[PDB]
Each structure stands twice: as C-alpha cells, then as structure tokens.
Curated annotation (Swiss-Prot), chains B, N:
UniProt region (Interaction with Gp41), positions on chain: 5-29
Name this polypeptide is given: Matrix protein p17
Interaction with host AP3D1: annotated span: 10-17
Modifications made to the protein after synthesis: Tyrosine phosphorylated presumably in the virion by a host kinase. Phosphorylation is apparently not a major regulator of membrane association.
Native source species: Human immunodeficiency virus type 2 subtype A (isolate BEN)
Assembly: Homotrimer; further assembles as hexamers of trimers. Interacts with gp41 (via C-terminus). Interacts with host CALM1; this interaction induces a conformational change in the Matrix protein, triggering exposure of the myristate group. Interacts with host AP3D1; this interaction allows the polyprotein trafficking to multivesicular bodies during virus assembly. Part of the pre-integration complex (PIC) which is composed of viral genome, matrix protein, Vpr and integrase.
Motif (Nuclear export signal): 14-20
Portion of the full sequence shown: 3 to 109 of 521
Positions of the UniProt region annotated as Interaction with host CALM1: 6-41
Curated annotation (Swiss-Prot), chain I:
Residue ranges of the region described as Interaction with host AP3D1: 6-13
Protein name: Matrix protein p17
Membrane topology reported for the UniProt record: Lipid-anchor
Full protein stretch here: 7 to 108 of 521
Subcellular location: Virion membrane; Host nucleus; Host cytoplasm
C-alpha cells in the first residue's frame, strides 16, 4: 500500500519534487504505487521502497540494466532515487537532483 | 498538518478526483493545505476539514456566499465538498459530482 | 536475512544497547533474526523491521496484546522498540531507554 | 452508572468531533447492555479503573471492529474521561485521551 | 499487482463465483486488489493470498475478529475463503460455499 | 521461518527427494532456509517460494543467469525446481528429475 | 595490451592482500573466454572497448561463476591500465571501473 | 568501518564462534573493531582484515612477537585467526580451533 | 507568556534538528527581554499574529544578524508554531512553517 | 494541568536533577509526577501547595527505603516542589530532598 | 549601460510587463532609472545584471521597503521585475513580480 | 583604497580603545571583500563620501548585525576619519566622529 | 591537479556573479572528467597554454553548447586565469579575460 | 568527613578493590580523605567526590593533565576512577579495571 | 553573598574599562560565581583574598588562549581580590596589574 | 598541507552538524598558521600521530578556550579522521572520534 512506502510528511515532501529539473509537473502519490508494481513485475520485493537501504538495494540491481533500459526502467530508477532522498531526508527539487544525490551514494558504496 | 484532513486511503482517493468532470487534472495534497489556510483567513478553525460534520458546517457558512463569491471561494466550497465526500466515503470522480452529493446533504 | 533489516553501523549501534538498564549482556545479531521469525509466527511481515514506520506499525498491533502477553511477546516488543531507536538514530543505552522513546512516539501518534 | 455531575458532563460531550449532537443517557444504557454481550460486568463503567479494564478487553478488536463495537469502545472512552475528570469536548478527543493512557500504562 | 495473487485459470475461475448464493454479480479482479490492500493494514503480508496455506493462515488470524468485526473484515474473510478454494482447486459456486469449504479445512486444522 | 515455504506432507516429501540422481543424501529443512535467504540477496521476494506460480517466477528470473552463474546459483535454481514440484503435487526421485518437470512447465510457459 | 601496459599490469595483484601478480597468461585466458561470449578480443585494447565488456558482464556479476568474475576482474584491471589509473590489486581496479560504470549510467 | 571486515553471513557466522573453548561468551562485532584499531598502532593496514591472504599477512608480521607478547597482542592475534577462517570459510567452534587452523596455514607456507 | 500545554509543548521542541537538548522557560524569558531591547512590545509574543509582526521586522535583518537575533527570530518562529497549533519537531521545522506563513 | 506557574515554574528549571550534573528539571517531570500520584489515589492538587506536598511525603516516607526506582523519583520530585512552595532555594535534588526530609522528621 | 542589465531576447519580454496588475508596460528607461537609483545607494549596477545580484539588491533594500519612500518602493519592485526576467519566470505585472522575487528572498 | 599618508595614519589607530593592537592593512583588505559580500562597491572606501554612503546603508543593521558587520562598519568609520583628515586614536573614537556626522546629515 | 597558492585562490572565486558558492576541488575533478569525453588530456589544465588549447577547441561549441559544456569552458577559463596570474571575483570575470585573450591571439 | 563521600556498603566494597591490577594490597579509608585533600589543594570542590556525576566532572578536569601528570595526579585520577565505579554501582577489582570503566564513561 | 558591606559598595566604584563610565555591578559577582561552578571550583573562594588567589593562580595559564568569558572572570576575580586586599584600584586594568604582581 | 584524495575528502565534511557549508582549503590554511602561534610544529597536521599529538596539547585548553582555539581543536579532529580513513559527516562527529581515540590513549 502507498501508506507503507511514503506517508505523513514524506508524502508532502514528495509532491514538492518536480518530474523534471525546470518543469512544473510534480510527483504525486500515483508515482509511488507505480514503482511498487514495477518492482513486482520483475520479482523484486516492494518492501525495499520502505527504506533508504532497500531503495539502495533496488538501485544496485537496476543499474547494470539502465544502459539498455526502457522508459519504465529508466524512470523507475529515477522514482526510487526520489524515494531514497526522502528516506535519507535530502531536500531535492527535481528528479535530476535526486539522481545526483542517490547515485553519489551508489558510486561511493561501490566496492 | 495535511495528515490530519486526509490520510492513507483518503489521501489516495482524493488524488483520484479530477478537478473538472471531463478534465484530466486531479487533486493533489497542495489543495488541502491551501483550503486549510483559507479557513485560517476566515477565522474558521481549520479542524473542521477533518470531519464530514465539520465540513458540512463549512458548506453551510459558505453556501449563501456562493452566488456572489469569487474564484477562490467557489473553489474552496468545491474543495471542502470533495473533502466531505471523502470523509463520507461517497465516491465522486470530479468536483461537480462532489457538490451534488454534498449539497444534497445540506438540504 | 539479517543483512536486510539491520546492516553496517546500525548493527554495530545495536550491539552497544544493553538488554537491561544496567546489565552487561548487550543485544547481538541473533536478536534480529529471532524478532523477525517471531513476527512470522503471527502473520506479520518481516520487512516491517526495515523501517521505523514499519516498526511503529508493529508496535501499534502488538500494544493491545502486551497486558496478557508471554515473554516472547514482550521480548519482541522490546526488540522492535530497540530497532526503532536505531532507524530513528536515537542513542539509547538499554531496552528501557528504547521502550521510553518508542512508546513516547506511540503515545504521541495515538489519536 | 453515571449520576449527578457525571451525567451533566456527559451531555456536554459531542457524539462526533465536528457535529452538534451530544451524548445522552441512552448511550450509557446501550453500552451497559452491550457489555452484557461480552460477559463484561456493567459495574465496570462506574469507575476509571473499571473503564480501563473494558478498554483493555476491547482494544485488540478496534482496528477490525464493527461500528457497534466501536460505539461501545468510544463510549467507554468518554466515560473514562468523566471518571478521569479530564475535559473532553467530543468523542474522538476522549478516545485520544483514553488510548493515550492505555498505551502508556502498557509495559 | 493483481497478477501475483491470482493468475491464469485461477483468475478466470474467480469470475465464475457469485458474491451471493443466489445472486448473479460474480467476483471481479478489483475484489482481489481490495482484499490484498486490506491485509497490508494488520501488518499481514499480501503474499499469503498467493497460496492456499497462506490463505488458511489469514483465516486463523481473522477468525477471532469475525464475531465483532466490520463487514469489511467479513468481506476480507469471505474473499480469502474464495481465494483459498481457488488455490486448493476446489470447485465452488458462491461465496458461502467457499466459506464452508475453507472453514471445514480450518476447523479440521484446529489443534 | 521454514514453515511458510513447505509444511506437513510437503515437508515430509522434500526429505525423500535425492540431491543427486544416484545419491543417497536427501533434502533437508536447512536447504529450504538457504534458498530462501539467497533470494533476499537478489532482491527476489522470499514469498515466491511459497507457491508453484512464484517458483516458476523465480525460474524465469534465474534462467538467464544459469549459463554464467555460480554453483551456489545452480543450487538455488535446482532447489526451486524441487520446491516447485512439491507445490505442483508432482513426484520426483531426485533433483535432476525435478528440473526436468519444472523446466518442462517453464518451456511450455515460454510465450 | 602490449609492452608498457603489460609491464604496468604485472605490478597488479591477483588479490588485494596476496603476493601473486598478474601475468601474460591472465590476458590469454581472458581473451579466450571472451570468444565464448562472442565478444571481440580487440575490445581489451581500449578503455572504451573495456567499458563495453564490463557493461555486458555487469548484469551477471552478482550471480556469476568464479570464472565469470575472473574475466570481469581482469577486464577491470585492463580498464585501469588504459584509463591510466594507478591500481595495485584486483579489488582497487574493480572498485574503480565499476565506479566509472555507475557514474556513466543514466 | 567494521562493515568492511566482515558482513552478511560472515558477520553472522562470526557470532557463532565461541571465545574461550568451554565458556559461554562468543565473538561480537566489538572484537573486529578492537582488532582493527589495534592494527593502527602497528601501522599494519586495516584493509588486511578484509582478506584471508591479508589476514595471513597480518599473522606473518605478528608471529615473531607472540611467544613473549602482551595479552593485547595475544588477543589481537587470535581474533585475526578466526577472521581468516571466516574469509576462508573453514568452520570453527572456539578460539583454539581457529588458532590451530590459522597457524597450520601460516607454518605450511 | 506561555503556560500549561503550550509550555509543555515548547519543552518538547528540539533546539537543533537532531539533538536531545530542548527548549525551556529561560528561552522565553530571554526572548521576552530581547524584544524590550529593540523597543518592541512584549505582548506580541502571546499571539501568532503579534509573533509574525516580529518575524516581519526581523526577516530583512537575518542575513546579517548576530547569533542573538538569529536565535530570537528562530525562537519566535517556534512560538508562532505553538500559537498556530502546527506541530514541529525542531527549530528549523518551525522556521519553514513560520516563513511559509510570511 | 498548570500545576506550577509563575516564577516557581522558572525556578524549577534551575534545579539540577543529580548533584553534580547539568540536566535540570523540565515540565515533563512535573507532568510525570502528577501521573504517578494518580496511581496511588492521591490528588494531583496536592502538588499545588507545600502542605499538600507534605501529605504526599508522609504517605511515601515509609516506602522510601525499599522504594522502587519510580517511587524514589516521585518522592524526590515532590521534595523539590515542596521547596518551591516553601520558598527554599536548592541547587539539586539531594539538597531539596534534605530540607523537605528534615522538615518531615521535625514535625513529630 | 542599459545593455548590460537586460538585453535582447529579455528586453522584448520586459516590455510585456505591466506597471500595475494596467495597460502601460515597462520600458527601457525603467532599467536605467533603477540602475541610476542604485547609484544613490552606492550599490553596484552590476548586481542588476544577474538574478543572484538582483536578490542581493533585494536583500539590501528590503529593510527599507516597509518604511521606504515612493522612489524606494519602486526600486525594489523594478528589481523584482528584472529578477523575474533573469530567472526566466514570466510575470504579467509588478505585483506578481514582487511576489515571485520576494518568495525567493524569504526562502533564503 | 587607502594608501599614501592615509595608510601610514591608519596604522596609528587602535583596534580597541586602549589595547596594543592597532589597525593594519589586513583590515582594509578584509573590509573591501566584506563590501563585496554586500553588493557595495569597494571604491566607496576610497572617499569620505563613499564611506559616508557605506555607513548609511549599514546603520540600520548595526543593532542586530553580526560581528563581521559591526567590524566592517567599525573599519569604515576609521577610513572616513582618514579621508576627512580627523585625528582618531581608536575604533570607538572613529565610530563617535563618523556617526556624529551621520546623524547631522 | 592544482596545489600551493593556486588551489587556495581557486577556492575563493565565486561560481555565479552575485552569489557566495565558491569553486571547490570537486569542480576541478568534474572538469577533468568531462575533458576525457573529448579526448583531451587532463594534464592540459596544468598550464595557461594547455588550458588555451582547451578553450580554442570548445570556443566554437560555446554558443550552441549544452550546460555541461558551458560549465567546462567556464571552469577552464578560471584555471587559465589562475595560471596566467589574473585575479577574478567570479566565473564571469574569468570568461571575460580568457575570451578576450582568445580573440586577441588570432 | 570521609563518610560523606563513601559510606557503609560502598565503604566496604572500596576496601575490596586492589591498589594494582592483580595485586592484593587494597584500598583504605585514608584514600578517600587524601583524595579530598588533593582536590582542596587544586581548589576543586570536595563536594564533587560524593556523586558519580561530580566524580566524572573531576576526571574531565584531570584527564588532559594525565599524559604529563604527576604520580600524585595519576593517583588522584585513579582514586576518583575507583570512587566513581563505586558510586556508579559497577563492580571492579583493581584500579586498572576502574580506569578502563571510568574512562569508558568519560566520552 | 560574596561581597557585602563596604566591599560591595567599593566594587561599584571600579570602572569595567580603564577609561569609561560603566562600572561593576552585583550581577557580575553572581555571574563570576556561576562561572566557578561551571568548572567545579569552590564558590566560597571568592569571599577571601586567598581563595581568590587560588582561582587566579589556576586560571592564569589559561589567559593567553582563553575566551573573554574567562578574561571577564579573570578580571572580576582580579577586582574581587583587590577589594579583599583593600587595594583601592579605579578600573579593571588597574586591578589586573596589582593582582598578577601577587602571582 | 593535504593533497588530492585527502583534500577532496576534506571538502565533503560540513562545519555545522546538519548545515551545508562544507570544509574548505582555508580551514586548513587558518589552522596551519594558528598552530604556529603555539610553537607547535606545522607538520604535525600531516599525520594521525602528530594530530593526536596536537589534540593532546590543546585539549586542556578547550573548556575555557576561545572559539579561535576551539576552531583549531575541532579542525584537527577533522584532519585526524582523514589520516584515520574514517568517513565522518561534520565537525561534531569528527570531534567525537578524534577525542575518544585521545581518551583511550
């Protein structure tokens, strides 16, 4: 359920994150459920969205598939990055800002 | 707190309510916070948004003010109408379907 | 898997929490696995331990059951309280300090 | 059960947080008769401690319970605050206080 | 994702079970989605719906609450009985027929 | 908890399946726990081992990695094949026999 | 890989704390293993061709055989030679090249 | 970080190894942290605890000092002996069995 | 200035966004006499409106302000959130909530 | 439950909990004290005067030597409140506990 | 010069902004007036040439705005207009330009 | 900014009313870069009139200003006295002479 | 890449005109990484002449250039200003001076 | 007075703490008074000896002086470490065990 | 309680600064008393010329690297000592000299 | 004076606990010129051993020390963390570790 992933202030913080750097379209609750059903399509547990570590576990798995990834894959990656910034409570203003902060953690923990 | 007015499934159903009957733009949690601060601008205690009876009280304060109301007020009356149906668990797909169910109760 | 719930510094910060307010016996890695399998007996998802919101959800469910609860029930309650203090980055010295900050959060969100 | 000042104060507690309807004597008559369905002694409603015992018995069913079990649960919370002599304007505020005391006492 | 709970012949057969013993409106896919999202609230895993053994586990946790539960809880209890008969490959015509079969196995499982 | 995967007759039947086509050492409860804890590393939900449809699902996610995977991974693949026939109510003498039955359903499922 | 880059490779350890260092036979085994994958062995001669090999192998590394990791490990070292990033063992090379993988992906 | 030395099943498997042969106390993550900090006194690189070969190299530099060494040295030596067994995945019950399995291997090479 | 619930709730607020040290009554006494130094009225600290009159006076002074003004502007931000009955967990959460209302 | 207000509430917060420490009394301690009193059947209004606090200390004094950690906390907090009501300046709990106890052993 | 503040593609956009929420739109002399008005403050005219420098003018002038003269208030609002153009935030008048430039000033 | 006889005369002015430390070239360089942080042109420090304009912009902020603002304000008062050729022995005497001219105009 | 006085003078040039955010080491690391996307040598950033090689290569791309290219050209302008012993307050003062020497020497 | 620092059961346990690690000659009552005398000379409040919080305050003053301190200071530092362990109700057997645990609480 | 009688009145004639009009008050003595309890020093040392000499002796090495809170305390105790020593100083810097010449 | 990796890693450490202003090169330039006012060897900042050698000398002076002294002590704690290969996040978390290594010594 959407209440399990993001809830309370974290949901309000999500809807202040823009879908694109300069755009005006912002994230909504439907993005949370879509990413969960996206994970369920590939056998990955939805419960990883509920933690910054589980989100980091999602990113480590999806990253070797991004180069050949579809639009759903390349964007599910971006949605998980947004969720990680909210679990880590890092103020990002857009998807590209979430990718910058989430992949910064991904680069650093690699190895 | 936004978590007060609508939360969980209520916050999910809210975002499934279109701003206009045929239109595609649906509600988002920003509209609850705006409608709350509209109550604060009126002196009305914001806590009326948390119950369908408190919302019904709001609709009674504003319904005389609608025929001459402005753009923000006709929208606030419409926003609290959607919040009422969500509290009342009456499924509406848009704004005018909510006013129809909420004002049918105001009778 | 134990690595899924508590990993890295969260596991080390766990092993500095006393089992009792003054005792020298501290929490170890076997307590994490025990609490996870304790939840599995009652149908509760193990993944709720992965986040402080899921831990708080565990506590809301277990709280009406504590007055007539066994030792494993109370031990599970106290262990989940410890995990919450680690997900919330709260420095507790023992179980009683964990239950203090965890139930103070449970009381505050009640209503 | 409720007599004198406790009955006057009960009829100042709203049935819903935003409504106008207040509690009446028939609400206590309904709760005591409902307690009979649980084998619970009706004299428990006459004390703070007896109310805490009803709530400890009813709590594991509240998230799933019927609106009748909830109405019973809500009423005992209101009766608790009267015995606790703590000001409550409506039902959900009495719920907030009674379950607050319930969670804290639990150890 | 509804695909996980019931798929294939099970998804097709679910829409042959009537909600009411004499009624005509049969089960939908949206009923599967609702029952799964209800389980996320008692902390119970959505995954128990994907197996008859997990459906029997749900009924064990739910039966103490049936005497004083909401019709929502009764609907979830009844739907889980229907999903169990689908997993168990037992042919049922309506909800209360699956209710009797899932409970007959639940009662025979007692103790 | 081993419980959730295989139980009762399934638990007694697993320990009759030979690890090797001519071997004598048969499957153990600990093999179920190991395979379950390996999926938690791949991000694959542990719950897919509780149903035959989730076992076919694990096989689909695992088969691309079999040509270049570790023997630890072949063991997870082979064990899922054994757990599948147990859920599928199909008799096998050994592991390679469970592979042929589970992969036959996997081949006929392709498409 | 030839001459100068071969000398630099032979100062890279097989394991982060071991004593054995990389030899000519390691490239011979790696290029021969690439043939089993259809990968052109000339890819090993460039930092860009090494990037291509690593992109192909990454979705198999967490599950891969000890033979697959040896190929992945050796190509990571060769990437660092072409990238001219001083690595003293296999772990530092893998850590460094996979680092470059994650940053480049988008 | 302690997480760099032992993690996952390795961190779990560590806490099954008994400390003293008969005693009830077992290894905690606190023992890896103490060891790792103890090597910073020697200048011995701390990343050596992450490898069985690195653990072997640790024992090599330490072995000339054990006959006369302090209990700090003895404790540090024995802890690395178990860490090597975990990297090597050679099962062990107490500190004595790990000392045997580590010091067989150091003498053989 | 405060009492009862508002006094207890003030003491539940963290000075810094992660510590354990919490607001106290001496902070209210300090902010009371800080207003009396700039000539402002102390009774503005009893309302969410008079509070934001102070917050309006101090905002164009924050980017160059000393630690006292920065703490005064921040303490008043916490007092406003108590008056506005909007729950905050630290000084900066009260800042983001008081300035949103500016 | 504005059990303490005025200068007394401000004076409560300059009293250190343990002798030699820096953590001083909060309002959450007065709230906690009145909550423990309700478990005894005592009146929360007893904390409003020095005389009503002496009623508490006289009921708790026989329990002090064997008292649980929560009882010693209650008795000691009431001693500080008694010092606040009796207008007695104290640095820490032991100083407040000493004066309230001496006044307790003196009226006999 | 007027050039170095707003130029070309953005000077055409400035001429679409109304002085009141009014028909008369902003001119080029409005940039020059605001620049030569900063000259009375000693503020650098180079601050008008970037959105970050425009916020710097707003910060310096905001303590004066509540008590500011008619020339004072105008300078602030015009700098708010220039910031909205530098920041590529369209604004149909001056009042909305004050809103967009001030909500950024308060946030930082 | 400040050179010639003015730089020599600046270094005869005490940092604090009666200390041993006096004004140095580091404070004018610091004041010039501080001015940059405010959007005020460093060229204002070159004249008494530019220093006069600096103080008018700063004076509203001195009751609440940080230590860097008060000290940046402090140095400018001394610089104004040098440009105006008025004998000053320390910062406070410069503050008194500068603010006196500030209020009178 | 840069050390001594130059590394300290770098951490003092403001990024945008009118801001506070000054250049950092991560900006030099980032610029050296984007250069390898062009085949240029990271060692070019170590002299005013080598940086002039970069500018002449990026100068024709500046007008239509992306945000990442403009940032690269601007960082190299700062580095050239450091090597050429030219004091600047922000990136814009730097491009001004480097581009003017870019136009003068043709 | 000696008894105001440690008394009774805690005074018995003090005499059961060895002066040196595996030693056998143990602490005395004169060690309490002599340590209070060292505080008097230092100007420190002798009152800090009577609580584990005041003892930790003493050791926070003495710890920077330990790397160069007199054997007198190391004696006072060790004595206060033992008195803290007695106050803190944390059983030790020698000075070195009290040091290892008073410094554990010194962070 | 530290300074009473002619000493407390003699204190309020000592100028806080060498040349200036603002002089010492009662709040400085109570503040100097709490600075002592912050360190753990005996508050009663302020009441004597020798107890004050115990403080200045301990604090004087801390002067070169100390905050002005310590310097204000070092100056206050320097002045408290002058009053106990019956040395009629007129300002703080006049007191530090006479006091440190006794160290 | 640090170099490359240590200098790059130093700039990922914030001054405030949860602030944003991260450490710069001039926080080392200030601390290097500050130690010379004690006579402590400037080169002690080049090693975790010399860093703890610094913290030993300064720790007695930090209860009463000015913020100039504390800023020196707190920066050295950050520098020791770099030589110890211990990823901290801010000054306080670095102050913690370098001080508890010192207390154990």
């Amino acid at each position: 359920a959407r209440n399990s992933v993001l809830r309370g202030k974290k949901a309000d913080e999500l809807e202040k994150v823009r879908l694109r750097p300069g755009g005006k379209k912002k994230y909504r609750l439907k993005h949370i459920v879509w990413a969960a059903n996206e994970l369920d399509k590939f056998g990955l547990a939805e419960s990883l969205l509920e933690s910054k570590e589980g989100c980091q576990k999602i990113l480590r798995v999806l990253d070797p598939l991004v180069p050949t990834g579809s639009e759903n894959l390349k964007s599910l990656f971006n949605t998980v990055c947004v969720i990680w910034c909210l679990h880590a409570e890092e103020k990002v203003k857009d998807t590209e800002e979430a990718k910058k902060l989430a992949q910064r953690h991904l680069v650093a923990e690699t190895g």
